[PDB]
Amino acid sequence: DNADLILGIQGEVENLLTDLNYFNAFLKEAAKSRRENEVLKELVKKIRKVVNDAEDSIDKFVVEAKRHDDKNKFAQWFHITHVARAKGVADEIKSIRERVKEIRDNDAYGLQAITLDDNEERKAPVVEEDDVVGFDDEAKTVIDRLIGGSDYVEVVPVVGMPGLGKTTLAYKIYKDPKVEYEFFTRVWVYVSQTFKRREIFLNIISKFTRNTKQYDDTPEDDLANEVKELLGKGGKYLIVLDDVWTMEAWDRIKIAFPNNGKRNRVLMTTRQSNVAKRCNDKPHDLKFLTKDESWELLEKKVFHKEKCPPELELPGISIAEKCMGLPLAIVVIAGALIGKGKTTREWELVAASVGEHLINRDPENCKKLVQMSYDRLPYDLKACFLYCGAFPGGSQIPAKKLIRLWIAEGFIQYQGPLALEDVAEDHLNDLVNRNLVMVTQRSCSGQIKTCRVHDMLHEFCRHEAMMEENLFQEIKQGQERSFPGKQELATYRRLCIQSLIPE
Amino acid sequence: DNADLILGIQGEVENLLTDLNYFNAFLKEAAKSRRENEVLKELVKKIRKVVNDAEDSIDKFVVEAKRHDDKNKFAQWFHITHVARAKGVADEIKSIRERVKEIRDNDAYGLQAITLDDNEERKAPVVEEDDVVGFDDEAKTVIDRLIGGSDYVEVVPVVGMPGLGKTTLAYKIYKDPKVEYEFFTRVWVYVSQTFKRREIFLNIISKFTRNTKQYDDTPEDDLANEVKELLGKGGKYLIVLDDVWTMEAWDRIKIAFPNNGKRNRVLMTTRQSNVAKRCNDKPHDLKFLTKDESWELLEKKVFHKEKCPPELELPGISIAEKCMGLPLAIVVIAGALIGKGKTTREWELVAASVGEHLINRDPENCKKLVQMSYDRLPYDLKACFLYCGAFPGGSQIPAKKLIRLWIAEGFIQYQGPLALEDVAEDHLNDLVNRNLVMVTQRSCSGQIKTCRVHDMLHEFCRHEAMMEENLFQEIKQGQERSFPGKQELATYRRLCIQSLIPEFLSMKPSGEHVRSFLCVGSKKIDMPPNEIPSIPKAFPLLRVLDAESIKFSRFSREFFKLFHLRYIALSTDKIKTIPADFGNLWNIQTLIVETQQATLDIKADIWNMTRLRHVCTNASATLPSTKRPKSSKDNLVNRCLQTLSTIAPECCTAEVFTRTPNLKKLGVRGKIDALLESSKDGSGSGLFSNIGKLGCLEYLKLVNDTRLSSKPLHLPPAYIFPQKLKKLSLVDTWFEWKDMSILGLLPELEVLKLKENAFKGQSWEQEDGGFPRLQVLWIERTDLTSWKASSGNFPRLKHLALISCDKLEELPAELADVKNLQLIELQSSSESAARSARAILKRNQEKEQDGDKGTGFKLSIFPHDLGL
Amino acid sequence: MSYDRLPYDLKACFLYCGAFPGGSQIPAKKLIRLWIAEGFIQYQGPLALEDVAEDHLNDLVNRNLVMVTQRSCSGQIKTCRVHDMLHEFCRHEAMMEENLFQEIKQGQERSFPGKQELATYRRLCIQSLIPE
Ligand SMILES: Nc1ncnc2c1ncn2[C@@H]1O[C@H](COP(=O)(O)OP(=O)(O)OP(=O)(O)O)[C@@H](O)[C@H]1O
Ligand SMILES: Nc1ncnc2c1ncn2[C@@H]1O[C@H](COP(=O)(O)OP(=O)(O)OP(=O)(O)O)[C@@H](O)[C@H]1O
């Protein structure tokens, strides 16, 4: 009859939802780790696109079903329009189902690769040793903080965004003459994101005992006891825990550090603020390089012991100010500029494409470093963090507005006793704790008022969201790139615009 | 023809059952271990949902096939309705078969992953070392227990729920100065759930010998011999076995511990009570932290050496009290709070979502710890344990009610010589032995009476059952979350509700796939008369109706359409009769009604319910006539009937007892004079003689509600009583104590309860002997004043109590000489009884001081401050 | 450990011994005749089927899975029985795993089997209440 069409398309809707459950599970499994196979990435993009189109069609069907109840309000004219709309969404659901069937039939190989998934060396970081720029005051502060304190084991944490230079400062402190005299025993430990406690203890033992083959059957608890004996027989000891990622790592490693009332110290570098807060009530937030220090570092990295040519001074300074005081960004730019021709035109070209260089020329250097923090994000927090890249770089995003946008976009799914605003605030706090988002202002009650992402993470978010995830696309003009045409605008899911809106 | 449709859909039914066998095997294999692949988990959810829908359709088909036999009773109208219903289930079976085919065709990859299943480091736990809170007394007790004992190897076990702090206490003992001086040799061994004996022995050897490469070809037996030599050459040795999980592990490791008469000790921490019981007859149950200690631990963990800010004191304390004294929960909360902003608003937010934090923020810390015990559960015990999460957190679940619910829900499948209740009790004992369920009260006979799950395990059960297994879903309001809509209510299998029941029922919910409604609320609610048919209309496939807290004034006709119903719990203040249409529910197992009326009439033919197991009431129930017509001439026997709690005295004929050969519990209320009166025939054996024909009878309760006892009553001779009777309860029956001697000739009697002046008389002297196996004796509100006994009168008496019996004067001194007497209760007694009790205590103290082994007798007098 | 080392043709013969009630003494002649009748003994050599079945019984006795309770004066096995615990194992394997045979009894809540499961029973062992 007249209402048979709604039930007929609803019959296809349940099957579409059943397929969507499988595809969403496939997307979650694929997002668990970074795939490097091109076929797998293309299949993931194809699955995500067909999923998003499926939600769009289902949302249209839900709206049509809700509006069907108002037939009596407009009689035949609304009946005719509703029939045409119902047929339109019917053929849309059919087309989606054909695409799902085509994916199942043709792309079975990638589905196998994810489902079974049958398919490393620990790279200790290397940092600047001699020409450390701007960390004289920071090192002196931490050294003075290491000297003074209680007689028990105290942890001085260094926190910051990825690439800030926590390890460079830690190594500068490690080699400082004042603590080389104050601390008789100095141990450097690289507590990577993944590590083995037995390997850590044996590495510490190797500092003192050359023969370590007699610990073959020694349990890890007795290895920790031996480490305690080796460290306690001397005077003060300073132990550097580099890149500690989780609270459990500190809890499980600290059993090997004895307490003797000798003012033993542990200097820990971490990207996580919660780990630092637990280990010390006042974590040391590493500073950003000033504009003058950024230019000085860039000049030293590019021209070695020599001064910059007078013609390259102005373009180079403009580049350094665009690095926003992050030493990792300055180092990457210096590597890119060294291969250039040392001319004003090419340096100005680099200044106009700082982000592209910082991301795409050498993804092996910095993109992996940012991906280390990004991939550890929960699956529901990845979309929330990538949303923050929609706003222009350097702008201050109100926390209330960002929370409302997250709830509106459906990222926050929650069913417990807390409100959705509280859950979104918890998500923002989690992002800030990982130092992926910087809080620029707080209310007098302690709430976050405005927050912004560092320019380099903002570039990473733009890269991931536009070219990999197709989360949102930006529209602008001014250069050879004009407003997008209908072909690619037909595939855009979210639209970010900043200027020339009426045009 | 007309009946061809039933066979046509049955043809599809066998194929559906064949597919269900494969899917159930797939589900069992997938449940053997915890899958981390998202596609695999989604497929498991899809398989489980289609399986559950298949059982629902098959159950509907079975009901339709059973009801097809009544075509002659309603002619064409029922024929038309049955045809429509048969077509409806036919298209339901077809839709299920299409979904099964779609799963087979599309989801083949996950089926491969489970079938072949082609796809770790031992993490020794780390515990607090310096700031151990509240374990000073516990450590001192265990240290003193380690010092004193026999000269052989003795094991001191520490038992408790996961996260209780057994290893923290063990390490505190391990580092205690008194045992560092007493025990020259101290060895710590981490006996994980999985371990290698060779690795354990080599680890122990490493404590003494640096060179261990010469044991490459040494057998494990000789390694154990070398460990024995190394440990025995010193003085005493203390060995800590951490997290021992099975009896075999202790049996296989202990071969390396020598016996030298040097008082060697083994301190073992375990989550299993049976392992502890074997290794020592009195396992040390680790205590829970008090509320003050929990707050102190939380304050130390969050604020280090500093005090809490004054504004955060009240919210923090509220959080600590919500952790229920579990140190693991306190540690997890402290980790979550350290990352917060140290403000009152955020701490209050955490206080409102303590469970969510304890489970979802860091599943790597605690959820894995609980999953360690949960995954070791047998596959048939996992559903039973998750059921315990339906009841509200902190509530006390009766063991009898939980057992009946488990049987009704079909979790207990058993075919041996034991009853289903015994199997369910064994399941509960297994859960308690693993310290997943805490027993809060036990009966005097040793049975479990009430049990509850710790709040944190209850949160884990809620997490697993709602988000992973879809076992049951909870309905509530008050916050932004409202009552569920039709879309998700269509997928809910079991419904747990606690409040606002009439408001939820006013919406006319859809419950086509709901098989259980559990009114777990404690408040008694009078259901409005217009909302009475809401329960059967909403949930046609209701299998369990736990409406004990709901008062029903009438029985609507739709209640008789619940042909899948197996459990009934109802309260009522108006119902006096059970309609005959209630007998149409042939699947009923347990029938509980709690009526305030004096009498209740069972007009429904409960004998037709062959699967019936319990009929528990509180008013005198009039059983229906056993006379059956020639259409049902066959002698159907209700062999599964276990309980007839409150049947009428006039219904205690030989006819009903023939149909109930396996009746365990029997109870009679009313004119018990009719029970004892001899029939008008020459023989003097009345209706009470029929009770003795029940060989399996074990419990008997008699309630005489009438006061017209103008003729003194006589107990029948002991050989008329059931031989295997184990418990007898009498109340308000107005007998005489001279008849106690008859009860003393019962060979199997163990528990006797007299209430509200069951026996009348001032004094009565018993001869020596009698009551061979009696262990529990309970008196309350009696006119007895004198009682004379002897040492041989109660060889095995253990419990003795008088409540409000101020008329009693004294007790025999032979009771103080009873070896098996443990506890005596005296309440609101005279000062002479108190002085006699003090003299008994003084005599016991003197006897213990004489040099013999301590008897361990204890005595309590309540109130303690009376007589001061 | 002992059962899995049995030859494939001896596993069915050993599980058959669980049909008789626990503790009963099974005549060797009757057991041999039953094995031949049930088709367990397939043989084509010069020896008789009774000799092959006797060899199977000797193999079971040699593995100490069957205890000989009486022997004839000529050395032959006259009566043999399985230990109660192995009999319980045979009952477990045959009823719940192999569906070799099923036992029918009453007295407790379990009654005589219905048509649904009786339709799948291959061999029926009964001890009492046969006319009922
Ligand atoms: N003060 C500095 N002067 C010069 N180069 C610096 C300075 N600080 C850091 N760098 C450079 O920046 C890069 C990244 O710095 P660093 O290795 O210290 O990272 P980090 O803050 O420890 O980060 P991560 O969390 O990724 O380990 C290195 O190549 C290092 O040489
Ligand atoms: N008295 C205590 N004071 C402070 N923290 C405690 C105390 N008892 C236990 N804890 C903490 O609780 C957590 C779990 O305790 P513990 O490691 O002793 O577990 P357990 O009872 O041995 O359990 P399991 O059976 O899982 O091994 C640890 O992080 C430990 O530090």
Q: Is B100 part of any known ligand binding site?
A: no
**What is the CA B442 to chain-centroid distance, rounded?**
11
Backbone phi, psi, residue B539, to 5°: -125, 80
Q: In what order do the strands lie in the sheet with B154-159?
A: B185-190, B237-242, B265-270, B154-159, B284-285
Q: What is the DSSP letter of A468?
A: I
Q: In one letter, which amino acid is B774?
A: L
**Pairwise CA distance, residues A465 & B590, whole Å:** 60
Q: In one letter, which amino acid is B86?
A: A
Q: Using most ligand atoms within 8 A of CB, pick from B130, B168, B374 the residue to mutate for ligand 2.
A: B168
Q: How far is CA A487 from CA A167, A483, A492, B333, in A?
A: 48, 12, 9, 52
**Pairwise CA distance, residues B429 & B436, whole Å:** 10
Ligand 1 atom nearest to A270, measured from its CA: 25
Q: In which residue are the tokens 């950003």 written?
A: A288
**Pairwise CA distance, residues A299 & A293, whole Å:** 10
Q: In which residue are the tokens 């469970």 written?
A: B355
* B chain contacts of residue C108, beta-carbon cutoff 8 Å: 417, 639, 662
Query: What DSSP assignment string belongs to B376-402?
Result: TS-HHHHHHHHHTTSSPTTPPEEHHHH
**Pairwise CA distance, residues B804 & B826, whole Å:** 8
Q: In which residue are the tokens 């261990």 written?
A: B212
Asked whether the bond before B772 is cis by omega within 30 degrees of 0, the reply is no
Sign for the CA dihedral angle at C88, C89, C90, C96 comes to positive
Taking only Cα atoms into account, the Rg of chain B, rounded to an integer number of angstroms, comes to 32
**Pairwise CA distance, residues B694 & A12, whole Å:** 62
Residue A286 contacts residue A268 (beta carbons within 8 Å): no
Interface of C with B in 76-105 (CB under 8 A): none
Ligand 2 atom nearest to B134, measured from its CA: 1
Name which of A219, A415, A416 is nearest B203 (Cβ-Cβ). Answer: A219
Q: Using most ligand atoms within 8 A of CB, pick from B127, B295, B301, B333 the residue to mutate for ligand 2.
A: B127
Q: In which residue are the tokens 């025939």 written?
A: B681
Name which of A21, A117, A416 is nearest B356 (Cβ-Cβ). Answer: A416
Ligand nearest to the CA of A132: 1
**In the beta sheet, which residues pair with residue B451?**
B397, B439
Q: Is A165 part of any known ligand binding site?
A: yes
Largest CA distance in chain A: 94
Q: Which of A499, A391, A400 has its CA nearest to residue A454? A: A391
SS3 string, B106-121, reads HCHHHHHHHHHCCCCC
**What is the CA B414 to chain-centroid distance, rounded?**
18
Given an 8 Å threshold on Cβ–Cβ distance, is B124 in contact with A219? Answer: yes
How many residues in total does chain B contain? 868
Q: b/e for B320-337, b at 16 or more Cβ within 10 A?
A: bebbbbbbbbbbbbbbbb
**Pairwise CA distance, residues B716 & B703, whole Å:** 17
Strands B776-780 and C102-104: unpaired
Distance B330 CA to ligand 2 centre (A): 10
Chain B nearest CA to A213, separation (Å):
9
**Pairwise CA distance, residues A394 & B262, whole Å:** 75
Q: Assign B336 to helix, strand or coil.
A: helix
Distance A325 CA to ligand 1 centre (A): 12
Q: How far is CA B42 from CA A27, B65, B466, C114, in A?
A: 12, 35, 15, 38
Nearest chain A residue (CA) to B348: A418
Given an 8 Å threshold on Cβ–Cβ distance, is A22 in contact with B39? Answer: yes
Number of other residues whose CB lies within 10 A of the CB of residue A174: 18
Q: In which residue are the tokens 């890269």 written?
A: A463
**Pairwise CA distance, residues B62 & B6, whole Å:** 10
**Pairwise CA distance, residues A267 & A173, whole Å:** 9
* B chain contacts of residue A380, beta-carbon cutoff 8 Å: none
Distinct helix (H) and strand (E) counts, chain A: 22, 10
* Contact present, B and C (at least 3 Cβ pairs less than 8 Å): yes
Given an 8 Å threshold on Cβ–Cβ distance, is C109 in contact with B640? Answer: yes
Given an 8 Å threshold on Cβ–Cβ distance, is A248 in contact with B365? Answer: yes
Interface of B with C in 291-350 (CB under 8 A): none
C-beta B167 within 6 A of ligand 2: yes
Q: Strands (DSSP E) along B295-415, which ranges?
A: 397-398
Contacts of B653 (CB under 8 A, 6+ apart): B687, B690
Pocket of ligand 1 (CB under 6 A): A 125, 127-128, 132-135, 162-168, 243, 269, 271, 297, 327-328, 331, 369
Given an 8 Å threshold on Cβ–Cβ distance, is B419 in contact with C109? Answer: yes
Residue B508 in tokens: 């006319």
Chain A nearest CA to B574, separation (Å):
39
Distance A201 CA to ligand 1 centre (A): 26
**Pairwise CA distance, residues B270 & B198, whole Å:** 21
Residue B205 in tokens: 């050897």
Q: Is B128 part of any known ligand binding site?
A: yes
Q: Which of A125, A134, A126 has its CA nearest to residue A320? A: A134
**Pairwise CA distance, residues C3 & B201, whole Å:** 33
Residue B260 in tokens: 């030298």
Backbone phi, psi, residue B214, to 5°: -80, -5
Question: What burial class does residue B725 get, using C-beta atoms within 10 Å of its C-beta: 0-12 exposed, 13-18 middle, 19+ buried?
Answer: buried
Q: If you take atom 3 of ligand 2, which residue's CA is the nearest one? A: B132
Q: Which chains touch A (3 or more CB pairs under 8 A)?
A: B
Q: What is the DSSP letter of B290?
A: P
Q: Is A128 part of any known ligand binding site?
A: yes
* C chain contacts of residue B420, beta-carbon cutoff 8 Å: 109
C-beta B297 within 6 A of ligand 2: yes
* Beta carbon pairs, A and B, within 8 Å: 111
Structure-determination technique: cryo-EM
**Pairwise CA distance, residues B805 & A176, whole Å:** 86
Query: What DSSP assignment string belongs to B151-179?
Result: SS-EEEEEE-STTS-HHHHHHHHHT-HHH
**What is the CA B243 to chain-centroid distance, rounded?**
25
**In the beta sheet, which residues pair with residue A497?**
A475
Q: Is A180 part of any known ligand binding site?
A: no
Number of other residues whose CB lies within 10 A of the CB of residue B561: 16
Q: Strands (DSSP E) along B219-330, which ranges?
A: 237-242, 265-270, 284-285
Helix axes A291-303, A327-338, angle to 10 degrees: 30
Residue B591 contacts residue B569 (beta carbons within 8 Å): no
Distinct helix (H) and strand (E) counts, chain B: 29, 30
Angle at A332 between CA A331 and CA A337, to 5 degrees: 95
Contacts of B401 (CB under 8 A, 6+ apart): none
Q: Which of B736, B730, B729, B724 has its CA nearest to residue B760? A: B736
Strands A438-442 and A448-452: antiparallel
